[PDB]
Amino acid sequence: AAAAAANLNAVRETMDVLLEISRILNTGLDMETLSICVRLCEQGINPEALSSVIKELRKATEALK
Amino acid sequence: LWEAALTYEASKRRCWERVGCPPGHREEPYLTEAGRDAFDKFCRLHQGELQLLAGGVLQAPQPVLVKECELVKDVLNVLIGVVSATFSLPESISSLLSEVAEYGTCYTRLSHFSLQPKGLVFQAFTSGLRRYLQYYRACVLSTPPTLSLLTIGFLFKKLGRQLRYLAELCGVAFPTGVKLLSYLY
Amino acid sequence: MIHELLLALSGYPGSIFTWNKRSGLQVSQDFPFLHPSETSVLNRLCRLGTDYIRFTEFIEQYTGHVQQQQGQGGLHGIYLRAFCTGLDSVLQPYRQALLDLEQEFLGDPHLSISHVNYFLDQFQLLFPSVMVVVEQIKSQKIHGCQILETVYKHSCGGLPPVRSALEKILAVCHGVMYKQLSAWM
Amino acid sequence: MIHELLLALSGYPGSIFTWNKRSGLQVSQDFPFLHPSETSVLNRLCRLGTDYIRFTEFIEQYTGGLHGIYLRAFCTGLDSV
Amino acid sequence: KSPNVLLQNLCCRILGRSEADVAQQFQYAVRVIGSNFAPTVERDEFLVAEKIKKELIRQRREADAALFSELHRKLHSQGVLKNKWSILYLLLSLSEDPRSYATLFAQALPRDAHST
Amino acid sequence: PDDRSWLEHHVVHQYWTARPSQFPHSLHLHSNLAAVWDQHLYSSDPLYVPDDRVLVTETQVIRETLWLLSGVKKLFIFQLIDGKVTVRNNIIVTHLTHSCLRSVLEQIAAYGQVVFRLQEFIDEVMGPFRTYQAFMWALYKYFISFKEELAEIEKCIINTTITLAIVVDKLAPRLSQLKVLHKVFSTGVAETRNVVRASHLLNTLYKAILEYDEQTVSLLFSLWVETVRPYLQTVDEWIVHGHLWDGAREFIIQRTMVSFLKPVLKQIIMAGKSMQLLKNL
């Protein structure tokens, strides 16, 4: 398939758009993890729950520093 | 799944007739910038032209076979004197085969001239000839591990002519004994 | 078209390159899918192989065909054999060039024609200049030491590679006259 | 279209813009796939490319004619700008 | 995949330690994902786009807000994401400022005059 | 069909073989310029009179022009009027509407005359004056370097994102250098005796080095040394061997004028003949 891979290039293009959005906002997230988050909202999820998850997980790496 | 497939090489060829997001389909190289399938079809097409111009009874050898290195190995076996399946004591492959085949055909007829041990100076002389026959036999399979085929005909051009001159000296009626020893002197 | 060219230029003609004695090597020139861009380059490259075939065939014909001893020195004599002996040693980098081309084409068979033409451009001048020097010897039936002047007048040239190349042959012809000269004095 | 336009700006007049020795690259031709007001926009853009043409001819003729190494230095900086 | 197996890869990206070395924060993740799963306000990316503009004026930059506008247009032009509101609200929640009033601020529809 | 299909795919075969140009374009004005232009032409009601516009792909033309600039000739594009490559008007691509196209290929044609004249001059040597070979040697070496640069660009074409405007700006300092050769060669063919026809050429380069005394001057200098090199050899032979030798005398003194060896010329003659007076002992 050829059109099914140009859509994957399209996914990477929006992923770089969200890369610029992540740096101007100063988030710690990288590209692989945001693709995991994209799949999470494919199944449907509260962003308020994902932010509480990540707002526990990042400042539970500051408790073993 | 996404990130596993994302990592591929993208479009760097750009269309000027499909400016908006070109997927690319490769601007079509030349006939001399294509080969080893277009080579074989190119040969087949010219031979098809030649058979049409003949009527189908022209019949050129080597339509396809064999290789590069294995053909080199059979050629190296002929230089010992071990004849091939084309000689005994594309179509242009047959010509290059003939030019190196006749050298080994000469070497066989020199060793066949020295196979026997009258004439006592002739007995010394024949044994002296085989001391260079061994040197010719030693040069092959010491210099090449296995080289390209054109190096074979090119490297053994300076060696085979020296071999060929002694065939003009030899008969293969003919002097022997003192009659040889004066003629040789 | 790729290997075919090298096989013909080395002196093994096929049918793509119909060997003639008046067009030399000349491509078939009747393909209903040929391109005019490649055509001029094909005709230009054919000239080197034509000169090469004429050179080697002459050398083969007039070196080592006797045991050294007519009365004419336009076809015979030690000086004449020394001429061909020097000419063969000058021809070695052409062989080297073709041998490099096969290796690059085995590495990448999609190389363009201009790359090849670019590499052979140094021989492209060298063969026509040296052609007339042997052509005068054969045509005028030049005998004896008049040979040594003939190359010497053409090694006053203003091309450095041609100058050094003819100088090689004149030194080779010098060896044999020196070899008699060491004995007679 | 703009492959054409970005080389019309490089200096070639074409048959969309008409070169002149009063003011070059004049468009008055109408196209229904272009806006009628677009020409005005185009007109402003034309004023740039004309000067770019008028300079290069100037470099061609020099180096009563004008000669000197100063003419090999004014035209020289005109290249880099 | 499924959410329960998806959270553990988050625990390996954000934390550097394995999911067999720590489970307590993985347990908090399970606890908050289980109990409530569906939003309490309506969605539209238009409103959070106008709020991302409000955040970018707030960090005393003004150029990147015109960057985000062409970027948010590209998000529409491609159209591979099923819910575009959630990830933009999500990046909005994790904002960081390097460097009054908050009871006025533009909010979502309350869903108190709304029944599904 | 089993060979023609394979031919058609991997090799172009659409403007030297009777198969009008095939391209799977998408559409839509940014690159559909020619069809838009045809509809505009129909709306202007000529009535029709079609021209020869073949709608061929783009990069092939660049490959052809670069080959033309490297020195080879006889290609499908670019009709020849008297030995002069001129623009072919029977071809369009999509854009440049055949009018900007007609100008850019004309500029390339004006450069192509200067390469054609030189290649014709070279062909008439391998198909004496005692400086022609020494001059064409340096010319040949120039082409050896220049052709390598151009073939490297073609090597980048086999491996694209290159347009016309990239290579013409890249080749700007070379096509400027080409125009100087139109001026040096013109003094070599403006002519009775073959030694005056030599000095009238070599004096041009001897002046043109002082004209710029950048990057051109190195080319002029390396061309000056290789044409004065026979004269260096001949004057040293006159000095050390006590005699001058050239068949039919390629020199200005007998027993228009170069100023190179002129300020020391009197000390040459006075040294040559006097060395002969040592040979007579």
In the block, tokens 């040069």 appear at: B139
CA distance E2 to A45: 12
Tell me how far the alpha carbon of residue F58 is from its chain's centroid: 23
In the block, tokens 């990046």 appear at: E91
Longest alpha-carbon distance in chain A = 48
CA distance A48 to E36: 10
* DSSP label at residue E104: S
Contact residues on chain B for F28, CB-CB shorter than 8 A:
20
Mapped onto helix, strand or coil, the DSSP state of residue E71 is: helix
Contact residues on chain B for F10, CB-CB shorter than 8 A:
28-29, 34, 38
In this complex, is the C-beta atom of C29 within 8 Å of any C-beta atom belonging to chain F?
no
Closest CA to E1 of A53, A38, A46: A38
CA distance F76 to F147: 20
CA distance F253 to B143: 61
CB A52 within 8 Å of CB A32: no
Residue F126 CB-half CA count within 13 A = 21
CA distance D73 to D60: 14
Q: How many CB pairs under 8 A join B and F?
A: 59
* DSSP label at residue E61: -
In the block, tokens 């490259």 appear at: C45
- Distance in angstroms between the alpha carbons of the first and the last residue of chain E: 28
Residue B95 CB-half CA count within 13 A = 15
Q: What phi, psi does F85 have (nearest 5°)?
A: -65, 125
CA distance F270 to F255: 13
* DSSP label at residue D18: B
Angle at the Cα of C134 (from C129 to C138), degrees rounded to 5? 145
Q: At what angle do helices F132-158 and F59-70 cross, to 10 degrees?
A: 160
DSSP bridge partners of F80: F85
CB-CB: which of C12, C95, C98 is closest to B92?
A: C12
CB count within 10 Å of CB D7 equals 21
Q: Which chains touch F (3 or more CB pairs under 8 A)?
A: B, C, D
Preceding peptide of F195 cis, ω within 30°: no
CA distance C39 to C75: 38
Interface test with C, best of B39, B42, B92, B165 (most C CBs within 10 A): B92
In this complex, is the C-beta atom of E44 within 8 Å of any C-beta atom belonging to chain A?
no
In the block, tokens 């073709």 appear at: C98
CB C22 within 8 Å of CB C118: no
CB count within 10 Å of CB E25 equals 19
Report which residue type is found at F69.
L
Report which residue type is found at B168.
E
Closest CA to F103 of D49, D7, D24, D79: D7
Q: Give the CA radius of gyration of chain D.
A: 16
Closest CA to E55 of E86, E87, E93, E83: E93
CA distance F74 to C185: 62
Closest CA to F107 of F88, F78, F91, F87: F87
Q: What phi, psi does C25 have (nearest 5°)?
A: -85, 135
- Which residues, at least 6 apart from F194, have a Cβ–Cβ distance to it below 8 Å? F129, F250
CA distance F45 to B15: 32
In this complex, is the C-beta atom of B31 within 8 Å of any C-beta atom belonging to chain A?
no
CA distance C94 to F267: 46
CB B17 within 8 Å of CB F25: yes
CA distance F222 to F75: 33
Declared resolution, Å = 7.6
In the block, tokens 């409103």 appear at: E47
Closest CA to D16 of D36, D39, D35: D39
Secondary structure, 3-state, F76-127: CCCCECCCCECCCCCCCCCCCCCCHHHHHHHHHHHHHHHHHHHHHHHHCCCC
Q: How far is A11 from chain E (nearest CA, A)?
A: 7
In this complex, is the C-beta atom of D33 within 8 Å of any C-beta atom belonging to chain F?
yes
Structural element, H or E, at residue E10:
helix E3-13
CB F69 within 8 Å of CB F118: no
In this complex, is the C-beta atom of F129 within 8 Å of any C-beta atom belonging to chain B?
no
CA distance E29 to E25: 6
Residue F218 CB-half CA count within 13 A = 3
Q: Rounded to whole angstroms, what are the CA distances from A30 to A19, C11, E17, E73, F89?
A: 8, 64, 17, 22, 55
Q: How far is F140 from chain C (nearest CA, A)?
A: 9
How was this model experimentally determined?
cryo-EM
CB D31 within 8 Å of CB D39: no
CB F97 within 8 Å of CB D14: yes
Q: What is the full DSSP assignment across chain F?
A: -TTHHHHHHHS--SSSSS---------STTS-HHHHHHHHHHHT-------------SHHHHHHHHHHHHT----SSS-BSSS-B----S---SSSTTTHHHHHHHHHHHHHHHHHHHHHHHHTT----SSHHHHHHHHHHHHHHHHHHHHHHHHHHH-----HHHHHHHSHHHHHHHHHHHHHHHTTS----HHHHHHHHHHHHHHHHHHH---HHHHHHHHHHHHHHHHHHHHHHHHHSSS---TT--SS------SSSGGGTHHHHHHHHHHHHHHT-
Closest CA to C127 of C166, C86, C172, C101: C166
CA distance E60 to E97: 10
Interface test with A, best of E5, E28, E77, E91 (most A CBs within 10 A): E91
Pull the structure tokens for residue C151: 């190359």
CA distance E47 to E89: 10
Alpha-carbon dihedral E65, E71, E72, E73, rounded to 10 degrees: 120
Q: What phi, psi does B105 have (nearest 5°)?
A: -60, -35
Secondary structure, 3-state, chain C: CHHHHHHHHCCCCCCCEEECCCCCEEECCCCCCCCHHHHHHHHHHHHHHHHHHHHHHHHHHHCCCCCCCCCCCCCCCHHHHHHHHHHHHHCHHHHHHHHHHHHHHHHCCCCCHHHHHHHHHHHHHHHHHHHHHHHHHHHHCCCCCHHHHHHHHHCCCCCHHHHHHHHHHHHHHHHHHHHHHHHHC
CA distance F149 to A28: 48
Cβ of C1 within 8 Å of Cβ of B39? The answer is: yes
CB count within 10 Å of CB D2 equals 14
CA distance F38 to F12: 25
Mapped onto helix, strand or coil, the DSSP state of residue D26 is: strand
Q: Rounded to whole angstroms, what are the CA distances from C77 to A8, C68, C167, C180, C184?
A: 80, 7, 21, 13, 18
Closest CA to B4 of A12, E5, A20, E81: A12
Alpha-carbon dihedral F116, F122, F123, F126, rounded to 10 degrees: -170
CB count within 10 Å of CB C115 equals 16
Closest CA to B93 of F127, F166, C7, C39: C7
CA distance C63 to C50: 20
* DSSP label at residue D5: H
Cβ of C13 within 8 Å of Cβ of B95? The answer is: yes
Q: What phi, psi does F41 have (nearest 5°)?
A: -65, -40
